[PDB]
Write a protein that binds this ligand. Structure first.
Ligand SMILES: [Ca+2]
Lengths: 175, 175
């Protein structure tokens, strides 16, 4: 099961490094664009976990209601992004939002014949990745409340899917 | 069984990306950065895989007989390093050398109390990581002939082990 290693690597190699100073970075950003914003950038890292492992390199196309606002400023250096979430045509929220890159690995594997990795396998591992990461975060309260996991599938009944609504539903669980 | 995911992530997200253009960068380098007495750089990525997962944040400080020579120059950016290997003071070879970074993840895990991840578990995963990666590489020849995995365990009598000697053993049996 690749999911297990993938989740631990993601946590140990990335989340555990960046989450500690996140709260300070967004704050610094908030203080300096407070004139322009008011409608402060919310504080947690929102991690998108599309279970179909479909990962554009751009929420700048994923949803008309998600719009790139700005780069969150400040071996590995971290390029986080701030986005506004619209609803009813209005800005309804702003948050640091990104895809869980290990889902790309799972996707690449399923596309790599020698991996012997079926579509059923990939989805199952994606689910296992999400679950494992949740368990990891559960045991690190400090990190668990510095980020939010947003896992989703697009509906079978080809009714319309809203990535922004998915994000907003979590973002409103807090405040 | 974190080793599974670590190996696949390392292959998909790094090795399979970098190995395709390795021999080109090495060829290119073996001239256009003219240094009179510089020796030819060997053709493959040599990857250090200590089973104890002990990765120094350097590479030279583990062994004075491994000496940094140059950065291998390159749409992502990659940091690879060239070293000369000494034997009785003499230059016995020149190669592109680095540690397998996923072993750092295994070491960090064993240090992370809540992982429930012991030194014994770490060694088991380290071996599995090597075996898994070797298996992956075997079914990807165009990438297997471009790198060499150097897995080793260190004898309790450290006077009986030299990291440079280990690299040299592999370096000597090839082109
Ligand atoms: Ca010893």
């Amino acid at each position: 099961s690749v999911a297990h290693g993938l989740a631990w690597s993601y946590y140990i190699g990335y989340l555990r490094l960046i989450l500690p100073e996140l709260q300070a970075r967004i704050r610094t950003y908030n203080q300096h664009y407070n004139n322009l914003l008011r409608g402060a950038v919310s504080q947690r890292l929102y991690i998108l976990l599309p279970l179909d492992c479909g990962v554009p390199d751009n929420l700048s196309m994923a949803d008309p209601n998600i719009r790139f606002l700005d780069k969150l400023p400040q071996d590995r250096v971290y390029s986080n992004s701030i986005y506004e979430l619209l609803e009813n045509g209005q800005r309804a929220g702003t948050c640091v939002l990104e895809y869980a890159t290990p889902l790309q690995t799972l996707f690449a594997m399923s596309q790599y014949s020698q991996a012997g990795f079926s579509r059923e396998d990939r989805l199952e591992q994606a689910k296992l990745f999400c679950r494992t990461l949740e368990d990891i975060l559960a045991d690190a309260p400090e990190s668990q409340n510095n980020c939010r996991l947003i896992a989703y599938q697009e509906p079978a009944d080809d009714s319309s899917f809203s990535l922004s609504q998915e994000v907003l539903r979590h973002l409103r669980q807090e405040e």
